[PDB]
Design a protein around this nucleic acid. Sequence first.
RNA 1: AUUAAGACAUUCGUGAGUGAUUUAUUUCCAUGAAGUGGCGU
Length: 141
Amino acid sequence: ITLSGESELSSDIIQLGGQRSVFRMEVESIEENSDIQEKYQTAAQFLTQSDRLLILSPTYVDNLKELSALCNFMWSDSIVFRNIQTTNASNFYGKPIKSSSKYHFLKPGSVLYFKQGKRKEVEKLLMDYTYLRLSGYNIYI
RNA sequence: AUUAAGACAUUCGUGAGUGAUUUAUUUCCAUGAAGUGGCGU
């Protein structure tokens, strides 16, 4: 996590969804001169091949036809996404308004086999969603 | 505030009903209530 206007995220007992699921949160501080993205990619470096694009986190594309047109193969799988939509001034104690759309993301482990060149083009297509990339989605190696 | 929250695998339910420890088997086999007379040729 990256936090600004420092709020000291303390260790405590948390909930991570699903019939009162309890987890022990341990908060460890790391050097501030470090972005977490290339830390994750350094962890994933041992799975890289020049001809591939390993999908590390679920990846959403508004048009999979374009992505198919930019590759020789899509050795991929489908995952489903539906989010609980709640604002600040929300009930929090009633029926939860779940996401208006079920979204189909790729599966971690999917590989996109691009053609000659066009790797930068598929990278640009994948990275155009910045909210998703910041949230932890559409991460590849 | 997170495809969340809430929910005892629980209620009812006799290990119970039918059923002789009964059938077959000689307390029997062998066996003398018997032996001897004694006293003065």
